[PDB]
Symmetry: D2
Subunit: 498 residues, 4 copies
Amino acid sequence: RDPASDQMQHWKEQRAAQKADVLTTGAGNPVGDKLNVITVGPRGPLLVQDVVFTDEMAHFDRERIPERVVHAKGAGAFGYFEVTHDITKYSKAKVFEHIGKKTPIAVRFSTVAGESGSADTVRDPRGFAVKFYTEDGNWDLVGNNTPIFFIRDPILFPSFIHSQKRNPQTHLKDPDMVWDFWSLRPESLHQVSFLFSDRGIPDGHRHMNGYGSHTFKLVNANGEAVYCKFHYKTDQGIKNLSVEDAARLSQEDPDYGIRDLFNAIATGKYPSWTFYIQVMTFNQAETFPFNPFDLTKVWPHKDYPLIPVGKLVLNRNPVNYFAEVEQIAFDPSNMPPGIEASPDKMLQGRLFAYPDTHRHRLGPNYLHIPVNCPYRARVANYQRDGPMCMQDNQGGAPNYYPNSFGAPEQQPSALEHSIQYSGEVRRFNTANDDNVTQVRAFYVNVLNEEQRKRLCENIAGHLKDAQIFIQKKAVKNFTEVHPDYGSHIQALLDKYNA
Amino acid sequence: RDPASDQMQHWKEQRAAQKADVLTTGAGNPVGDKLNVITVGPRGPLLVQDVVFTDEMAHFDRERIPERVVHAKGAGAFGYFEVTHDITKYSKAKVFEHIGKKTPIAVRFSTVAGESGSADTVRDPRGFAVKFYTEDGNWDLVGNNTPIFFIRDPILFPSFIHSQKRNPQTHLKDPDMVWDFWSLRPESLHQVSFLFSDRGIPDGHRHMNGYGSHTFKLVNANGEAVYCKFHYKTDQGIKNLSVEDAARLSQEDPDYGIRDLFNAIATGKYPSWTFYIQVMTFNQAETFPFNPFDLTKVWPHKDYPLIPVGKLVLNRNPVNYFAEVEQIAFDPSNMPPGIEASPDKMLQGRLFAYPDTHRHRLGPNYLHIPVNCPYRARVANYQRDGPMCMQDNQGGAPNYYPNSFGAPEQQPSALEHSIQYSGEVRRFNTANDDNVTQVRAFYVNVLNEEQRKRLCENIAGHLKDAQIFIQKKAVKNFTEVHPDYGSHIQALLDKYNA
Amino acid sequence: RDPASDQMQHWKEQRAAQKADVLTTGAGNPVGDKLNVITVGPRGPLLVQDVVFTDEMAHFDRERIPERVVHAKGAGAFGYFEVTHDITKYSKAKVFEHIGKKTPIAVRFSTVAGESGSADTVRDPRGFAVKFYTEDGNWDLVGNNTPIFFIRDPILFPSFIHSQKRNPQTHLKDPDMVWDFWSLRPESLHQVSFLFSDRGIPDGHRHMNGYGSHTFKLVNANGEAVYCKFHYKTDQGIKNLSVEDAARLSQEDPDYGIRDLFNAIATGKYPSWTFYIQVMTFNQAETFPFNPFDLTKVWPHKDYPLIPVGKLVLNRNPVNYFAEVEQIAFDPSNMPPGIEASPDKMLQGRLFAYPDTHRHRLGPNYLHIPVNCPYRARVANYQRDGPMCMQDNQGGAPNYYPNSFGAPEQQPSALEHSIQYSGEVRRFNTANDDNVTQVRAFYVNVLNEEQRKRLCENIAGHLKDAQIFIQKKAVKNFTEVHPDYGSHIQALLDKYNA
Amino acid sequence: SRDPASDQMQHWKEQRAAQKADVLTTGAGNPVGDKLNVITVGPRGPLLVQDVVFTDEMAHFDRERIPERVVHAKGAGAFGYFEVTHDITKYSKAKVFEHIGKKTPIAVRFSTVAGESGSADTVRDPRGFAVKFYTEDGNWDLVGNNTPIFFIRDPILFPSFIHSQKRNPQTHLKDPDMVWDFWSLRPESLHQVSFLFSDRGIPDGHRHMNGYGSHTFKLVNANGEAVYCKFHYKTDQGIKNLSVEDAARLSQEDPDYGIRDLFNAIATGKYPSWTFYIQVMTFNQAETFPFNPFDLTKVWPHKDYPLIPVGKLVLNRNPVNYFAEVEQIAFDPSNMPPGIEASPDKMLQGRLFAYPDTHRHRLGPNYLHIPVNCPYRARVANYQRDGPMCMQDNQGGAPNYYPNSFGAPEQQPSALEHSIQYSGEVRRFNTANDDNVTQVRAFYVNVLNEEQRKRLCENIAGHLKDAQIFIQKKAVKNFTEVHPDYGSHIQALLDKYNA
Ligand code: HEM
């Protein structure tokens, strides 16, 4: 009797008021009997000329595409972003042009490590990907529910993902892998501390915040630029699940977040987020006491306050999930003029990985998929062909550039902003950037002892199943942040170890 | 110039009287400079943040799809099929519903053995596929320029195709392979004789006939059935290129068939074909002097004369060749009600092979591409998902059948025609059915002494390159068709063997 | 300190005393630093010439392949099959040739509806696939832990699967879908009663049986044929979990089946199964009160007793799960001489489905994958090419049959059995084919009073969520099996709809 | 009395010295009783699904084809070795150059450029000359051409140039407007177009042509010192070309002339060889070079940069299966062992991405598991896993994350990349107006005699004539800037054609 459990009945109401459609093959031929197969006699074998069977059976056999290598389990919704404040002094992006402008958006939430059948309510970072359909093209802000990440170099991302997933022989989640990587890489202390905090299991997707995480770049109409951070905080309030609640729910309803989001929109409780930016000038980036492009660190609110910008509103549920959610593609490199990448190593690597994996998971022409289409921008270029090529393939337009025959032209208004760099082209070590200073501020200044104990309990509940030498180096890293942090964990580890 | 050479100039005189479009990325983001790459300094290395380069380059790297395993080289056009005579007593198909009914058609000609770079004017059968967009879905008549073929059992087709293409080690056309298989399978004599006659290299595609080759089955409104052939003869006249003419044109213009057909439609010289059918009753099927479903045999006109039905007209050149011709897919299994298959073993195998290879060459959802979409029918079934799902995926419609929720329903007016078959289920040998009779009639009656000489010499020019024991068995088959036939070729071979 | 948790340390104890391997790219180039990405200066952007990063990131972007459309969540193991008795009177199959002959096997257990991330201890059928690498090629016996199935016609299979999986709009398991199809298809009664009994949730894969379910056909050396059923019963004893235990484990260890099997093998507690068959002669097939090819029916033991055959033993864990378990493919069409298919419409449908779905999920040459390779037979034929062709591609052997150059030859002894059938070619309706007779026997004779209580409880526990009109027609089906059956369920349903 | 290619099926059979035929099996190894007749219900009845033999063979026939190479689709392949003759360890520490007399297996694919899988070999086109070294430090792919230069000097123009070299997107026909509108708007193409439309446009097979790395590369020695090098391999068979008349004839008579020619030469023992040289430019001379030494449209003059010998390439083994060993072979310019790196050549930078990207598309994500692409002389050990058509053991139970405490593969600092300092703005620097004419004039006036200049002009005219007049005018102005005689001679011919 919930809106999700009645969707077939609601879809019906319209069909009772018509007749049914005629059942057809894929080629549109009417089917006379699709409940019984063609055989010679009632007890005879099946015949090849039963095309109706093979046509439907062969499409069933190809229903599955590869799930996302990460963030495989998720839920999608649609709505709009509305400007509420003028930040045209920082970014000339059309999406910020004037107060009151609405831009259609697509959103997909997710976990990270679990695959397409896992539970929603498990401890994991929560993906929060937003796709803005602007006139200067699509702007993908592929954020998640934390301002930081576990690593600061993108070449370590496949290893970290491997360590979070299944053992390659046993196919089991391996704590030895999980904490051997985290202990050997102490830059994860910051996001690990956030991961095992209360915010590690949000109460559905509507009660959590979202962050672009990376430092980005904004460019105004004068060609001047600043660096920035994208925040969108829930208007529904920060709400989490205790580990007792999510465990029950992980079995009771592994699709808790999907059901919650669909039911909420289906009854008009349209969720919303307030969209902010932090701004840091180039001079301020030269005097920041850390690397401003270090994904393990936040811009403190005192020195870089939140400037409000707008509002994210989700008011439409997907009609077909596979078409509109499973096949949606977010590319962090989808950035319209007035918004550019920073030299954040992690973001730099993301600029390659997403279109690369999307050409594998979906296909070379994945931007032709309806939800991925920049349907508010006029696409015209010199790319042609590819498997599953749709529309007119830009027809008979000349396919080489430059040309003398009227094909599209570049326009200097969309050219990037120039930055001077100097240095050797090599691999600079960032393993020993500051790993504990901002974490100590998190352990002492952000949490109460009620949250400190739950956090130390949350880590010890899972680290206990790793090897003792791993716990040694793990605790060693927590004591460098706070001796309270380590010894608190160490006592609880002494408990499970007996 | 000819309308083919001027196609870029004409596009300029239709579009380029306005401003030029905006050159964008795949995601629609405008591009300021698509002529120079992003580097650090004028002589510095390339940067990953030049995603404009990666967007265009990665799509270029993915343009190519597998060519057709056969008939890789061809040309496409579009037009209509119009009804001129009433054959509704034979077939209830909506395509012949009333005289004057027009149906949009898609057509693609082709050679057979050559790949995408081969020449048009070479000795080879000529594919002639026609796609009818009917209200009952698409009907694909995937014919060629001969009423017969080389074999009568589909299990030998992959080897015959292998024998006609490149040697697996040298990648060269091997005459040993061609005539070893042909001498070992004398059922090929009928189509080998047609291949080496003047028709083997028709003057383009407008000057050849088209045939469904196979015996088909027609069903009227009262359930009664008849067996039929599909003929469509050229209205522009039969015309053939000579050996020196085609050899020269293979050098001067490999794409002769493309250019000729394109320019004809472009100068309003629309080619056309007169549609016919032969009808054979089920009682006549039992009295037929051969297997009536034997693809190596014709139905003689004296005993089974042609019957007018309609006309085929091609009057629209493709706008983008890749999207409309290279991506087009014809399935002989695509038959609307009133048109069914016969027990032709060859056709029986083709029922599986085409939708099977199309899921590979194009993809599981290849019917979603525009030219293969049945855009005059209403596709409604319980198939969902698949790679590159292009439509709404039928929304939130119930995906299972039967169901109590108004989803599509089978209609019993589309049921197939039921007939009894007699015998054990078993591999029946057709290798030594009649191989020579209808070939002797082709040699003595269909040709004159001018055409026999030119045909015998055409065979000798290719058979001479195989080994002697291959020439021997080949002559043994030709001598078995007619003594003058075999001795004629043996005379030429002796000359070449010197 | 179970062997699963200590897999990495055990692997390192085999290192120990070996210097670790040099870390390379895909092309074998040694890597200097795989922990830091190339940039222009310590805080400059990323460079395309960091091929090491791209080489690794691009492969991580492609790790995932489509999961199985059904039976996605599974566990694999290896061992052997040993012949214990003499059934050469029935089957000339070399896999049964002598008592004591050992044939290697590979096995995969699985759930059905859950996808890759789902839990093991849920109510579902349990796939039990066995691949026999025989000297006559591979024999795939793709069974599950029940001798019957929900349907008896393969064209209903996509819809049954669709109704068991997620709603197309909400992406949630939909009880209306599950029971609308089940209520409208009473042929599901027999397997539904099994599914919701105690046997619906086995305590791991070692404590369940396996059945081929379908009728098969055995042929001996003298051409005599008989029909057959396959049975292999667990020597570890049938053991099932309560829904309370199963629901609890689905939160603790969703991989309960994988862990129990991996650790049982690794501690030498090899599970085993006793392989049986039931034999029905063709004369008994026509006298049989039921249709001996209806997948919803069993063969009663009193009239067709279990004939012992051999032993299945699993004594080796997989080394790489993805390479050995995820990529393994079973085709019921893989059958050596002495083992044939029956006119069982369901099996007839499966003959096409598995190779079809493996060419998509895995690739056209998925038989080249080692676990799918028939490494005890010599593959030699005229198939060539295909994407990712890995072996010698059969070198430079003549690729056409027949030929005169000593290529592989057919041998007539491997010919199939020839039956004569009778009747039209048409779709015969099998919806009302005795849907209750063997179900009432299951309720009355097989079960005690407790089992009936749990059965009706497990039924009403899930049917409670279907619409009232869906419950009525469902209770109608159960009451047709037995008035006590459907009234006990109805008595429970009213306590749920209150 | 027939070339070895013709007799290959006969030679295959007689290799079976009275062996007895292999048993015909399905894909899964099941013996086939009758692969000549399909299963029917009666002699005149319809086909049955339980004929698994027919479907198994047919469905694999339906999937034989893979996408062709987006460029260089038409070509031939051969295998052999590279032998070191001189000591260049002063310049590079590559194991393939380790000591004099050291041999390394090589695989080579020759190719044309524009035509697809069915085109003719003896047509005017650049010739691909890719060489794969299976060294103990992994594979070294040297993906070269038969010319030391190219048409453009920025990788972003390569798709547009290739498009303008292939078929018109509506008519599927070759288009002179497309071809000569791009070249005339991009006058950096002058240098390589002149080489194209000279006598070296249609070589007489693959054995009678040179090979070059074209790009400037970098060589690093054992001390960490680097230079800028050019790779050269010269035919030991002599420069030999086909006339326009004979090339036209052979394109019809024998479309696969080069494939056949190379195969018979190896099969009769006439193994072709190429002497491997290197040009060497220090970093000081790099700052003094009158052009951009990383400009792919320019060569280092031999008088100023002489050839230093290294060894010879030798092709002595034909492929056994063309599809598996030639059609499926994959060369990646980014396959470079230590002691060999890339220069900031913008064209080389784009190719670092394109080939492994296009190879994951054409062949599949795990294309390095294909044998002819396998670096079978080095032990692959990394933290990559799974993927479509995972072939070997997938590295077993080895830990799949780095760093790790369980003895999995480790980086070694001896393979670390050479470091160069760069300075400037990060932006798009224009190189369209670099020197486009200086070396083009040297080739027109000195490398060619009067007889070759006429054939050169007649080849440009015989093709450019089919373009529109306004394209001919801007094209001649480009040739005029090379030399007035150059532009005037072409204009003299074009006026004859256009009448
Ligand atoms: C018309 C009926 C059926 C059809 C069309 C069908 C189809 C399929 C398909 C497409 C797969 C995926 C295979 C893969 O991707 O690896 C599969 C898996 C499987 N099926 Fe069915 N199925 C049917 C009924 C059955 C029956 C009757 C049984 C057993 C008696 C069964 C047992 C299994 C098992 C065990 C697997 C998993 C194989 C593995 O572990 O890799 N199925 N089926």
